[PDB]
Write a protein that binds this ligand. Structure first.
Ligand code: CLA
Ligand code: CLA
Ligand code: CLA
Ligand code: CLA
Ligand code: CLA
Ligand code: CLA
Ligand code: CLA
Ligand code: CLA
Ligand SMILES: CC1=C(/C=C/C(C)=C/C=C/C(C)=C/C=C/C=C(C)/C=C/C=C(C)/C=C/C2=C(C)CCCC2(C)C)C(C)(C)CCC1
Ligand SMILES: CC1=C(/C=C/C(C)=C/C=C/C(C)=C\C=C\C=C(C)\C=C\C=C(C)\C=C\C2=C(C)CCCC2(C)C)C(C)(C)CCC1
Ligand SMILES: CC1=C(C/C=C(\C)CCC[C@H](C)CCC[C@H](C)CCCC(C)C)C(=O)c2ccccc2C1=O
Lengths: 31, 75, 139, 729, 37, 39, 69, 80, 141
């Protein structure tokens, strides 16, 4: 009934793109 | 000389409180059991409870300066 | 009120049998035990004070209240008018450092007319200064 | 030097203070070289979206850790005895005692018992399995990525919002009252009646189930026609079990009043009907201000019409003051947020609306104290931005004779009367506490001044408490306001007369003195903050404080010596007061609820009236189980709070160094350390690029303030959590 | 110390990464940035 | 003693004499009438 | 246009004595900016820290003084 | 560097010039006071911001102001 | 002006003297003409024997040089009031700093210019609202 390892890895992959998008926002907020 | 007068009136107060308002002869009668006390408190607002039973029926505040043992050492 | 009076409280009647003697009078705890019987107590046996303004409990609050409101006003008036009568003699600084003690004793005795003198000074305009001749701070 | 990019005056000094000053002026966008008016607003808007994505990542992380490492499926089986789990422990420094003591709440891995209210929240929302709230965590990751993309695209020159869009106050106040406060509360009432209430009725409603079944069997048509009583046809009775179908009559909007007798919480149908009845009024009040359509209000004519004889020029030329500046808006926003955050705190302990959160006492204590410590921060920041508004963005030639200028004209009356009120409360609250403490010390506790708080007991009497016998306006059953036939009469009366819950607690003679103490802390903190805001422009010492700025160290030793002359330094002293009065009210709250939860109400009612009772039965007695978190014999699960206790003491005393000692000593010491590094033989290879100096005066003030604050917060979050988790866990 | 949950292997590498590998390269990149010209 | 009257009328000696007189009448009123919480 | 020893209220709006009365000690010659020497009885915040007193005399202008005599 | 601005309230009492231990202030001629001189600060890159000139000045809210601006090696007073 | 003529005074050596800033960024040098061989306390630390005639002393900050100039002008009965404080760069150039006009700044002379002098009171300063985003200062403009 608990979670699986593939759900945790999918959560890491689906949170990888907020890291890229926050990197884009931080870069354009610096300049 | 003025500060020496302040120390002499302080030392006079210690020997006078050990003479009049203490239990030095009572403590000298039984040094092991009863406890020294050289300050009696006037009961005014309920502070007569500060005069605890220091031993031998004498009430007062138990001194911790320990100059009673100085007096027994001097004689 | 939900508080039981001290005339019939069981915890207060259990605690009043061993009230401690405060002064050198050996019956001081007993006369305190019958003095505090008129007050009202909670579930602990200690006399509470009704302060709502009802006159049946005015002895708890209002009777000392106006008593202090005399004495503070007395001190305030003795401290105020004395400053006025040392606004000039020759130099107010030394007369504030050392006290002109006959003038101070005169004000200290005469200060018991303070509330009528307060309404008199408020009506004469010599109590509250104007809002323009006061040394304010810059905005 | 490239860092800092925004400041040119800090990119040229060779000292080490330019790193600190580049860090602490990174968000003050007004003092940036080369920033116009509209670039300020656009950088604020993109940074707003960055923060609104960070808060979604934080909520997604709480959701993901309850899904992954939390016993949420084992908590819903018996939520009265088992403990919730925040996350797991993976530091490699754990020995064997710290693993055998941290495997709590039935888990083979070392875990950490959650003391926030996320489990009772997620159970009251209707989440049952870990999969749906893991899917909520993935959804919040996508939503945070959406707001990150919004922050990126609102920095491009094509999608750059103009300054007149930010100045459009009436065209966003409507959408914040209707399209943000109304339709989102409308959607929350919809989620309540569709998912939260049927999961409290036992019916599992998911995303593949809500399109088929209706929440009410009567359908949507009784709302369209009328006669809405069928939506409150049969409520859940007193014999209802949460999460199951047992005595649970289906009706979605039932106004009952009072508590659910099984979960000690508010009825979920009452919550849904309340949110519908607030969403309607918010959408109604959102149609007030004028937009492109000619119907509505414009705030200039409302403000200019509120003149007066005693008021002066009223609120004339005041729309431009709020709309041009930003620290005025931030001060009003922080003030309103601070009052409603303390409203959250005062209504999440007396009116709990979560399943079985009135029994988890440590969770309620941690949530109340957290929201009060947020509210004190926001109130201090509201007044701090008021002082920044008076320094930077206040012009007396446009705000002529209005309420702001007339506020400034009598500042010597305002802060002197606050000085009077502070001395009035302080002299006599301390006078009564020392009088009580002396007469208890002399063995005569009958001589205590125990003033009965008859005003608050009168408020309880007109609220429903028939305990005190004051038959006034709600406790008297034949009153005008009692016999109205409203829905909330019998349930709220039986809830307020039940001496089990924490709603309208029995106010004794100690609470009179402690509420005067909180009035003292509030009046003195308001004294320092209003004195900082109104003397932000100038005073008799230096009337050019508008020219020096907000934060500056002093004005030398001349003219008496003006240490702590800025309005920043009035924030500085008021921060200590906000921590002090928040410590006062949270000591008072936690001791009152420790007397309530244990059933020993007589201990707080007898001992709180003097100061040694606080020092003995609260600080000395309740901290016995905290410091025994690690003995020489063994280690229990309260060891991390004992270590956090000593940690908080260490940071709280480390702030004393920056507070007491000042800069010139440390500069003379750093001269000697510089000499020792420049004359040590083998360390002449390694030389600094930036010249090391001591911390600046206002800077190390802020550092000592930060250590005082986080030291205070860490040692109190250690003690407040571990004492009531040692007593009830 | 182990993990009863799913993917117990993952904090075994994520705790030293965020403890050492993330702050060392963050302080390295920041010290290179704030001391350059 | 044209200077002793001025020294006995300085601010510390006069405020100490006034506080001694105030504490004296307070202690005497509390001895002859002790333990008055109210009226 | 003031004499030597007349009471006058100050309207400097940035000084320590703002609304307090002062006696004109002397009026100097014309041409200079602030000729009106005004003396007060209340000293201001002046000098180093812990100094026993400050200054009272000051040069003021003509258009910022309200004569009360 | 800091900015030492000297206003027209200066009476030419030259206390601030002999008080400043860095030789930034100096008396220039003027025609607006009895002393017919006013202080002036040409060497403002040597001023550390000690505000010792704002302790010896007789005017109300002293006629010389030291606005603490940028910092450098001279304005921070470093011998290293 | 460009060349420093003088002899070093008699001194045993100290630790608060010239650090590594002297051969890297700048240092200072005071030159004065003594009368006798008296004793003076240098701001570096300790006492030193002032040599007879024109002597030269290297210091690290300008404040130490002006503190020595105050000690030379007040704490001697033959009041030495002919000292010159130069600034020496590691490139070799020497800048005449004080009393570079030629006469002391305490007294007035013709040839100076009023730098940094305002024509208003401090109460007549402008407000920071009208110049809220110009980048200037409320005291400058
Ligand atoms: C326990 C410590 C303590 C105490 C008692 C006070 C007390 C006070 N502070 Mg305070 N403060 C403190 C710590 C403390 N502060 C700290 C740590 C800070 C952070 C730096 C501040 C910052 C601060 C600010 C910024 C301000 C105050 C102000 C005040 C005063 C008004 C508030 C009040 O409650 O009315 C009165 C309460 C009292 C308790 C006064 C009674 C004091 C004694 C008991 C009087 C009895 C006389 C005494 C026995 C005579 C001594 C005799 C001896 C020589 C033998 C009050 C005197 C304000 C002020 O003074 O303006 C109104 C103000 O603006 N405080
Ligand atoms: C007797 C002179 C006198 C008078 C009439 C007043 C009157 C007043 N003061 Mg006050 N004050 C005084 C002396 C006096 N003060 C002194 C000596 C001090 C220094 C300790 C203060 C410190 C003080 C503060 C800090 C504050 C006031 C405030 C106030 C106002 C509100 C009432 C109040 O709180 O007072 C209560 C008085 C006190 C708390 C202190 C006074 C206590 C002394 C013991 C009173 C007697 C002084 C003197 C020895 C008597 C002279 C007698 C003469 C024959 C020699 C009121 C107008 C408040 C204000 O601004 O209101 C808007 C306020 O915040 N006062
Ligand atoms: C020598 C002592 C020591 C050390 C080194 C640690 C170390 C750690 N403990 Mg720990 N612990 C200790 C003693 C110690 N403990 C003791 C005595 C107890 C009591 C028994 C505990 C109880 C305990 C518990 C109960 C838990 C830990 C956890 C952890 C880990 C934190 C996870 C992490 O890296 O987050 C990153 C660390 C932080 C975010 C904190 C740093 C905050 C910084 C300073 C503020 C921000 C600075 C700046 C703004 C941003 C950074 C700048 C930078 C990027 C350049 C970490 C490995 C946790 C764990 O296992 O992880 C899940 C955990 O749950 N510990
Ligand atoms: C329907 C249209 C709509 C909507 C939904 C929004 C929504 C928003 N706008 Mg916006 N705006 C709009 C139209 C709209 N705008 C228009 C037409 C304009 C034209 C000029 C603007 C101009 C504008 C500006 C200039 C700014 C925003 C900003 C914002 C955001 C700030 C609100 C926030 O984060 O807290 C939302 C808070 C709540 C919904 C609740 C408030 C707190 C309540 C009252 C507390 C009590 C209940 C509480 C929820 C209980 C909690 C329980 C717990 C368990 C959760 C928000 C996302 C700001 C921004 O960028 O921030 C990101 C900003 O600076 N807007
Ligand atoms: C809605 C919230 C909000 C917002 C948007 C702002 C926004 C602003 N504030 Mg502000 N403020 C707020 C709330 C807010 N404030 C509150 C609640 C307070 C009271 C506490 C203040 C007090 C305050 C002061 C006193 C000042 C500002 C200033 C400013 C401006 C510049 C900020 C800056 O550069 O900081 C830069 C950021 C920092 C310096 C970071 C410091 C905070 C760190 C994180 C605290 C350290 C905690 C520690 C790491 C925890 C350790 C935990 C564990 C490891 C042990 C900016 C407009 C300044 C201004 O306008 O004048 C220049 C200013 O002087 N604010
Ligand atoms: C902000 C919320 C938040 C917080 C406080 C934490 C905290 C923690 N997580 Mg975590 N996590 C989060 C969100 C969060 N997580 C999200 C959204 C995910 C999904 C990808 C994960 C996935 C995750 C895994 C898979 C693991 C942890 C673990 C841990 C623990 C050790 C630290 C670590 O290795 O993290 C490293 C985390 C990552 C590499 C991915 C998450 C990074 C998030 C998305 C960034 C958060 C942004 C943040 C607000 C920025 C702060 C800025 C501020 C300094 C100014 C620590 C308790 C470990 C653990 O349980 O050890 C016992 C572990 O194995 N987390
Ligand atoms: C927050 C994160 C964190 C983490 C995860 C740790 C973890 C650890 N600490 Mg530690 N510590 C921390 C913070 C942290 N600390 C802080 C903040 C402090 C200051 C208070 C300390 C102070 C401290 C002390 C004083 C000691 C430890 C020790 C230890 C270790 C105990 C077991 C041991 O001997 O390891 C053995 C050592 C290691 C595992 C070192 C790592 C070497 C790795 C295996 C080599 C990998 C390099 C590889 C070639 C590069 C790969 C490239 C990459 C991209 C893949 C353990 C690894 C103890 C110890 O002996 O550590 C040396 C010890 O005495 N710590
Ligand atoms: C707000 C200040 C305040 C007030 C209103 C009172 C009021 C009172 N005190 Mg009191 N007291 C105070 C502060 C105060 N005290 C402080 C600060 C102390 C410590 C020095 C004391 C120590 C004290 C004693 C020791 C006694 C009183 C007593 C009394 C009562 C009678 C006084 C009298 O002479 O007749 C009266 C109700 C007397 C009593 O019996 O109370 C019933 C008494 O014996 N007080
Ligand atoms: C400085 C400054 C500032 C700040 C300020 C602030 C911060 C304030 C706050 C304030 C506040 C914080 C206030 C609040 C208050 C409120 C109130 C006061 C309310 C009341 C209400 C009422 C009264 C109601 C009634 C009732 C009751 C009570 C009960 C029953 C029910 C009813 C409803 C009937 C600003 C920003 C402006 C800017 C400028 C400057
Ligand atoms: C009865 C009672 C009560 C009530 C009270 C009240 C409500 C109050 C109010 C109060 C108020 C509402 C007040 C007002 C005031 C105002 C003013 C305006 C004042 C005046 C003052 C002055 C002016 C001063 C003067 C003086 C004097 C008189 C003396 C001395 C000197 C002096 C100068 C200080 C209670 C409930 C508590 C309780 C019971 C009883
Ligand atoms: C100790 C002390 C110093 C000396 C402070 C120094 C020398 C700073 C040294 C800081 C060391 C390097 C520790 C800094 C690291 C901290 C953990 C903070 C981390 C860095 C942040 C950027 C995150 C002062 O300069 C000072 C000035 C004014 C009043 C009081 C004091 C004061 O008390």
């Amino acid at each position: 009934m608990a979670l699986s390892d593939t759900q945790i890895l999918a959560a890491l992959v689906v949170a990888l793109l907020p890291a890229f998008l926050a990197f884009r926002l931080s870069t354009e907020l610096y300049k | 000389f003025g500060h020496l007068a302040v120390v002499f009136v302080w030392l006079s107060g210690m020997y006078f409180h050990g003479a009049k308002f203490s239990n030095y002869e009572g403590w000298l009668a039984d040094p092991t059991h009863i406890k020294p006390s050289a300050q009696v408190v006037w009961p005014i607002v309920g502070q007569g409870i500060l005069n605890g039973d220091v031993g031998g029926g004498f009430h007062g505040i138990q001194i911790t300066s320990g100059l009673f043992y100085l007096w027994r050492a001097s004689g | 009120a939900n508080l039981t009076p001290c005339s019939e409280n069981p915890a207060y009647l259990a605690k009043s049998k061993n009230f401690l003697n405060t002064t050198n009078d050996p019956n001081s705890g007993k006369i305190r035990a019958e003095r505090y019987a008129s007050a009202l107590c909670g579930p602990e046996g200690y006399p509470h004070l009704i302060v709502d303004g009802r006159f049946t409990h005015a002895g708890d609050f209002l009777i000392p209240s106006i008593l202090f409101l005399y004495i503070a006003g007395w001190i305030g008036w003795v401290g105020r008018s004395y400053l006025i009568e040392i606004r000039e003699s020759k130099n107010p600084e030394m007369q504030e450092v050392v006290i002109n003690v006959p003038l101070a004793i005169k004000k200290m005795l005469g200060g018991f007319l303070w509330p009528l003198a307060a309404v008199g000074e408020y009506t004469s305009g010599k109590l509250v200064m104007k809002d323009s001749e006061i040394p304010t701070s810059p905005r | 030097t490239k860092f800092p990019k925004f400041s040119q005056d800090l990119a040229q000094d060779p000292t080490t203070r330019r790193i600190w000053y580049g860090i602490a002026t990174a968000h003050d966008f007004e003092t940036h070289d080369g920033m116009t008016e509209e670039n300020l607003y656009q950088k604020i808007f993109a940074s707003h979206f960055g923060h609104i994505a960070i808060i979604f990542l934080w909520t997604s992380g709480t959701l993901f850790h309850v899904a992954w490492q939390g016993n949420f499926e084992q908590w819903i089986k018996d939520p009265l005895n088992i403990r919730p789990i925040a996350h797991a422990i993976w530091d490699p420094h754990f020995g064997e005692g710290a693993v055998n003591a941290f495997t709590q709440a039935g888990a083979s891995n070392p875990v950490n018992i959650a003391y926030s209210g996320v489990y009772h929240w997620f159970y009251t929302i209707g989440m049952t399995t870990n999969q749906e709230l893991y899917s909520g965590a993935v959804f919040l990751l996508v939503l945070a990525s959406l707001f990150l993309f919004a922050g990126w695209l609102h920095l491009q020159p094509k999608f750059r919002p103009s300054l007149a869009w930010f100045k459009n106050a009436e065209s966003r106040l409507n959408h914040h009252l209707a399209g943000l406060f109304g339709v989102s509360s409308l959607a929350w009432a919809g989620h309540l009646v569709h998912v939260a209430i049927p999961e409290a009725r036992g019916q599992h409603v998911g995303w593949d189930n809500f399109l088929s079944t209706p929440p009410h069997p009567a359908g949507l048509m009784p709302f369209f026609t009328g006669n809405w009583g069928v939506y409150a046809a049969d409520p859940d009775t007193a014999g209802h079990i949460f999460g199951t179908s047992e005595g649970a009559g289906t009706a979605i909007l039932t106004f009952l009043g009072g508590f659910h007798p099984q979960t000690e919480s508010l009825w979920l149908t009452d919550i849904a009907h309340h949110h519908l009845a607030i969403a309607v009024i918010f959408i109604i009040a959102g149609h007030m201000y004028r937009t492109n359509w000619g119907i509505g209000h414009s705030i200039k004519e409302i403000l200019n019409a509120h003149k007066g004889p005693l008021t002066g020029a009223g609120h004339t030329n005041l729309y431009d003051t709020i709309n041009n500046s930003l620290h005025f808006q931030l001060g009003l926003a922080l003030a309103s947020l601070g009052v409603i955050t303390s409203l959250v705190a005062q209504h999440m302990y007396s009116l709990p609306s979560y399943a079985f959160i009135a029994q988890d006492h440590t969770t309620q204590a941690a949530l109340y104290t957290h929201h009060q410590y947020i509210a004190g921060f926001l109130m201090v920041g509201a007044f701090a931005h008021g002082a920044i508004f008076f320094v930077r963005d206040y012009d007396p030639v446009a705000n002529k004779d209005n309420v702001l200028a007339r506020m400034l004209e009598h500042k010597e009356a305002l802060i002197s009367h606050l000085s009077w009120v502070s001395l009035f409360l302080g002299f006599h609250t301390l006078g009564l506490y020392v009088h009580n403490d002396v007469v208890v010390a002399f063995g005569t506790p009958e001589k205590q001044i125990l003033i009965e708080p008859v005003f608050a007991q009168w408020i309880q009497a007109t609220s429903g408490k028939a305990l005190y016998g004051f038959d006034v306006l709600l406790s008297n059953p034949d009153s005008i306001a009692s016999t109205t036939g409203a829905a909330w009469l019998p349930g709220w009366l039986d809830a307020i007369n039940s001496g089990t819950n924490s709603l309208f607690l029995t106010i004794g003679p100690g609470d009179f003195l402690v509420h005067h103490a909180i009035a003292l802390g509030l009046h003195t903190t308001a004294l320092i903050l209003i004195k900082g805001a109104l003397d932000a422009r100038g005073s008799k010492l230096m009337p050019d404080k508008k020219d020096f700025g907000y934060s500056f160290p002093c004005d030398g030793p001349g003219r008496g010596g003006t240490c702590d002359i800025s309005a920043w330094d009035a924030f500085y002293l008021a921060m200590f007061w906000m921590l002090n009065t928040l410590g006062w009210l949270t000591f008072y709250w936690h001791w009152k609820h420790l007397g309530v939860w244990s059933g020993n109400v007589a201990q707080f009612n007898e001992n709180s009236t003097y100061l040694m009772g606080w020092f003995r039965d609260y600080l000395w007695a309740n901290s016995a189980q905290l410091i025994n978190g690690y003995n020489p014999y063994g280690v229990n699960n309260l060891s991390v709070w004992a270590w956090m206790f000593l940690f908080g003491h260490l940071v709280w005393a480390t702030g004393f160094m920056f507070l007491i000692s000042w800069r010139g000593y440390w500069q003379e010491l750093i001269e000697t350390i510089v000499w020792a590094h420049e004359r040590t033989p083998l360390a002449n290879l390694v030389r600094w690029k930036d010249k090391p100096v001591a911390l600046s005066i206002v800077q190390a003030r802020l550092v000592g303030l930060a250590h005082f604050t986080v030291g205070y917060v860490l040692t109190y979050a250690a003690f407040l959590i571990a004492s009531t988790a040692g007593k009830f866990g | 110390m182990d993990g009863s949950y799913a993917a117990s292997y993952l904090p075994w590498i994520l705790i030293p990464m965020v403890g050492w590998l993330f702050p060392a390269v963050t302080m390295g990149l920041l010290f290179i940035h704030i001391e350059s010209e | 003693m044209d200077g002793l009257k001025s020294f006995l009328s300085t601010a510390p000696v006069m405020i100490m004499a006034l506080l001694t007189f105030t504490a004296g009448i307070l202690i005497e009123f509390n001895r002859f009438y002790p333990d008055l919480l109210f009226h | 246009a003031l004499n030597r020893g007349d009471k006058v209220r100050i309207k400097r709006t940035e000084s320590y004595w703002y609304g307090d009365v002062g006696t004109v000690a002397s009026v100097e010659k014309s041409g200079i900016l602030y000729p009106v020497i005004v003396r007060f009885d209340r000293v201001n915040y002046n000098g180093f820290s812990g100094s026993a007193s400050g200054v009272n005399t000051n040069n003021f202008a003509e258009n910022e003084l309200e004569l009360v005599q | 560097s800091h900015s030492v601005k000297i206003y027209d309230t200066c009476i030419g009492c030259t206390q601030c010039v002999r008080a400043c231990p860095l030789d930034v202030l100096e008396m220039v001629p003027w025609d607006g006071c009895k002393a017919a001189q006013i202080a002036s600060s040409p060497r403002t890159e040597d001023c550390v911001g000690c505000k010792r000139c704002e302790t010896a000045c007789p005017t109300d809210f002293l006629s010389i102001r030291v606005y603490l601006g940028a910092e450098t090696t001279r304005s921070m007073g470093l011998a290293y | 002006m460009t060349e420093l003529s003088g002899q070093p005074p008699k001194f045993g050596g100290s630790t608060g003297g010239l650090l590594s800033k002297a051969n890297r960024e700048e240092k200072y040098a005071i030159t004065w003409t003594s009368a006798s061989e008296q004793v003076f306390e240098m701001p570096t630390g300790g006492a030193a024997i002032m040599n007879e005639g024109e002597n030269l002393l290297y210091l690290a900050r300008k404040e130490q040089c002006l503190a020595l100039g105050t000690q030379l002008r007040t704490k001697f009965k033959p009041k030495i009031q002919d000292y010159k404080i130069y600034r020496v760069y590691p490139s070799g150039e020497v800048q005449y700093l004080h009393p570079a006009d030629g006469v002391f700044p305490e007294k007035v002379n013709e040839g100076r210019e009023a730098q940094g002098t305002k024509t208003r009171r401090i109460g007549q300063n402008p407000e920071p609202v009208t110049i809220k985003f110009s980048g200037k200062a409320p005291y400058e403009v």
